[PDB]
UniProtKB/Swiss-Prot annotation, chain A:
The lineage of its organism: Eukaryota, Fungi, Dikarya, Ascomycota, Saccharomycotina. It is found in: Nucleus, Nucleolus. GO terms for molecular function: RNA binding. The keyword Amino-acid biosynthesis does not apply. GO terms for biological process: endonucleolytic cleavage in ITS1 to separate SSU-rRNA from 5.8S rRNA and LSU-rRNA from tricistronic rRNA transcript (SSU-rRNA, 5.8S rRNA, LSU-rRNA); maturation of SSU-rRNA; ribosomal small subunit biogenesis; rRNA processing. This is KRR1 small subunit processome component. The gene is KRR1. Changing C125R: In temperature-sensitive mutant KRR1-17; grows normally at 25 degrees Celsius but fails to grow at 35 degrees Celsius. Component of the ribosomal small subunit (SSU) processome composed of at least 40 protein subunits and snoRNA U3. Interacts with snoRNA U3. Interacts with MPP10, KRI1 and with ribosomal proteins RPS1A, RPS4A, RPS4B, RPS8A, RPS8B, RPS11A, RPS11B, RPS13, RPS24, RPS25, RPL4A, RPL7B, RPL8, RPL23, RPL25 and RPL28. Required for 40S ribosome biogenesis. Involved in nucleolar processing of pre-18S ribosomal RNA and ribosome assembly. Essential for vegetative growth. It comes from Saccharomyces cerevisiae (strain ATCC 204508 / S288c) (Baker's yeast).
Swiss-Prot record, chain B:
This is rRNA biogenesis protein RRP5. Interacts with snoRNA U3. Interacts with MPP10. Component of the ribosomal small subunit (SSU) processome composed of at least 40 protein subunits and snoRNA U3. It comes from the Eukaryota. Involved in the biogenesis of rRNA. Required for the formation of 18S and 5.8S rRNA. It is found in: Nucleus, Nucleolus. HAT repeats lie at residues 43-75, 77-112. Present with 8860 molecules/cell in log phase SD medium.
Swiss-Prot record, chain C:
Present with 8070 molecules/cell in log phase SD medium. It comes from the Eukaryota. It is found in: Nucleus, Nucleolus. WD repeats lie at residues 1-35, 38-79, 80-121, 123-161. Interacts with snoRNA U3. Interacts with MPP10. Component of the ribosomal small subunit (SSU) processome composed of at least 40 protein subunits and snoRNA U3. Involved in nucleolar processing of pre-18S ribosomal RNA. This is U3 small nucleolar RNA-associated protein 13. The chain holds residues 494 to 655 of 817 of the full protein. It comes from Saccharomyces cerevisiae (strain ATCC 204508 / S288c).
Curated annotation (Swiss-Prot), chain D:
GO terms for biological process: cytoplasmic translation; maturation of SSU-rRNA; maturation of SSU-rRNA from tricistronic rRNA transcript (SSU-rRNA, 5.8S rRNA, LSU-rRNA); ribosomal small subunit assembly; translation. Keywords: Cytoplasm, Nucleus, Ribonucleoprotein, Ribosomal protein, Ribosome biogenesis, rRNA processing. GO terms for cellular component: cytosol; cytosolic small ribosomal subunit; nucleolus; small-subunit processome. Component of the small ribosomal subunit (SSU). Mature yeast ribosomes consist of a small (40S) and a large (60S) subunit. The 40S small subunit contains 1 molecule of ribosomal RNA (18S rRNA) and 33 different proteins (encoded by 57 genes). The large 60S subunit contains 3 rRNA molecules (25S, 5.8S and 5S rRNA) and 46 different proteins (encoded by 81 genes). uS11 interacts with eS1 forming part of the mRNA exit tunnel. uS11 interacts with snoRNA U3. uS11 interacts with MPP10. Component of the ribosomal small subunit (SSU) processome composed of at least 40 protein subunits and snoRNA U3. Belongs to the universal ribosomal protein uS11 family. This is Small ribosomal subunit protein uS11B. Transmembrane segments: none annotated. It is found in: Cytoplasm; Nucleus, Nucleolus. It comes from the Eukaryota. The lineage of its organism: Eukaryota, Fungi, Dikarya, Ascomycota, Saccharomycotina. Present with 3370 molecules/cell in log phase SD medium. There are 2 genes for uS11 in yeast. Coiled coil: none annotated.
Amino acid sequence: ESSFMTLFPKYRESYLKTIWNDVTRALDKHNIACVLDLVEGSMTVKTTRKTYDPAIILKARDLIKLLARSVPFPQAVKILQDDMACDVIKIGNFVTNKERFVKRRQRLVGPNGNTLKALELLTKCYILVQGNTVSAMGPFKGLKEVRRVVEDCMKNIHPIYHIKELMIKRELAKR
Amino acid sequence: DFLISHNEEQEARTILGNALKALPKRNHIEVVRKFAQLEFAKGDPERGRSLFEGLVADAPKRIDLWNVYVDQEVKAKDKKKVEDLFERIITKKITRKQAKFFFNKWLQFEESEGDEKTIEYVKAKATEYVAS
Amino acid sequence: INALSVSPNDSIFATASYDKTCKIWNLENGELEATLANHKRGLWDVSFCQYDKLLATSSGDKTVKIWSLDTFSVMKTLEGHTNAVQRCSFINKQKQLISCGADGLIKIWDCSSGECLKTLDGHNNRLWALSTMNDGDMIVSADADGVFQFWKDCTEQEIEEE
Amino acid sequence: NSQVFGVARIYASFNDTFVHVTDLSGKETIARVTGGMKVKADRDESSPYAAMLAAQDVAAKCKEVGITAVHVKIRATGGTRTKTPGPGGQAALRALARSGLRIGRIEDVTP
RNA sequence: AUUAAUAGGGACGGUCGGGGGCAUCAGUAUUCAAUUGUCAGAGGUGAAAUUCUUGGAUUUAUUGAAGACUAACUACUGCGAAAGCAUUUGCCAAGGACGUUUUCAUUAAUCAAGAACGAAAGUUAGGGGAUCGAAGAUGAUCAGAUACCGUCGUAGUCUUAAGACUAGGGAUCGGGUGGUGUUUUUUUA
């Protein structure tokens, strides 16, 4: 069949090579030719004929996107199941000033991290912002509202009230 | 207007609608005012009156469109159309200075026509409109 | 404007149009008193039954609303259609309002009752034109194909039979 | 393989999905799976039960047309949307495994 | 023909901006007219309501009209009279390292009134609405002038809204030299 290939960052190939043993041992059994082309600086996976399901090509494409997002590859490539969604949202195309981008990133991080990741934990998302993109993994129902709130926090408005509204919506979800 | 001089009306109107769709909506109000002024002067007066009426229906607070419709009616100098325009102006709601200018425009239209009975009826209607 | 409607007593004038506007205005003048817009897609035709002075709007959606002559409110409604209506016919019996539609069928039932009486499916695809004339309730409908059907009131002959 | 093949262009979203039966060209008019016509409850269509129910009738008509191998064209919404589907991709893959369709020329048509 | 902070400067060749002005080169997603795997359900989706509803709506068996912008690679690594700038060309105000004993000693220091762009929903409805107010009035035709040149009312004019630590222990940061290999820089110290 065809193949899915994408280039990765400088530290992504060093991070992925530490977990490339069990990843390739499961991908080749699932008909995915997961190899790291260090000469070309890219990771590719070819769909072979040793797959018992057609979702292996879709799961390897999501795993390659999770591996190239400079996130934890072993904690983000286990979304091969149906009720496990991992995606990356590029928030770098939201601001122009570097000081405004740094101020928005501090608001997105929150006070000591947990002040803004509490709503991410309430929405059950393993959110990790790396550069201009933020990758989160979890249930699709919990991450759809989380990514919409992340897009609202990525806007030019202050995300302090959005984080407070997200905690209010999480508190109102108990009913 | 060059197509109107070249007797191309339906193709120019479709081009004007396509140009108004491409143009911004804020500039489309002035473009429709320029198109209605071009259609009243160089184009068909029925198309110019239709464009002036449609612009008046689109903007409910356009004294410019009322003046453009008055200028289009004064281009043909029709007494029945001026009486219809005065009735439409009477149907519309105006301010204190706006109704005074409308009564002055109705008096100027009555002075241009020359009907003293209609001028007295317009003055009686203006006094009734003042008593409000 | 999709279609108009003239009052048979020569009083008022209503138009159904593409911008979901049921503009009702004068006949001697163009003085707009009111317009109605509470539908889904648009308004296609307006039916006048001046014997009881009702206003039946055959709208763009399958919903057909019945309006009064004065209050401009919804006294009655018609539902149960599939695709579109586009034309409703007034009735010599003054209540059994006839409705053709975009599915090939004619449905007629009493508007004062509000429950379905007769749904007739002589045509196949979609109806374009439909009209009636008075003393014999004689219904002609023209569909999206070339075929026309003709239906007349003969119920006094049928009730003599059984 | 005696030219018994086709392509499935699955345009799927978070709460809806659609199937386009394709050849290499626009041929192989087999079927088209609806999104919420199998179950109308605004949560079963997001679940894989209603998507596989529509895919069961889609694969039955696909076998009636005569296309065995399916070339995957996974299309998402893309752009300003989430650019990802819900459970429709896993349900179509499970329906392909249940039908025993041959896997080959699989691609992603997402924008 | 003492002065050279080489106080400072046309210059001088090698080499440069996602600064910036055009010049072509790609189209990533949308709108309408196309037109369908003849699919009426699809946005939204505290479950809802609600937007568009059997006027074809994921789409399409892609033509044009337009704008549009650099995706994993990737990313401030940098570059702004300044209100800011992310593929690919040819041209230019000018900006850029550096050496100069070569440019001259003579290219005023802060600048407000005078000039150049001049930005985080140019939103809502009553009121004084007067001075005036574009949009168009109307005079002289100038083969050609909304301003050339007098005469009027509307958004406006202005408020109403989103330890006295007694002591040690390893690690940590900032260095440097003994030796060690490349990097720095291999004259741009």
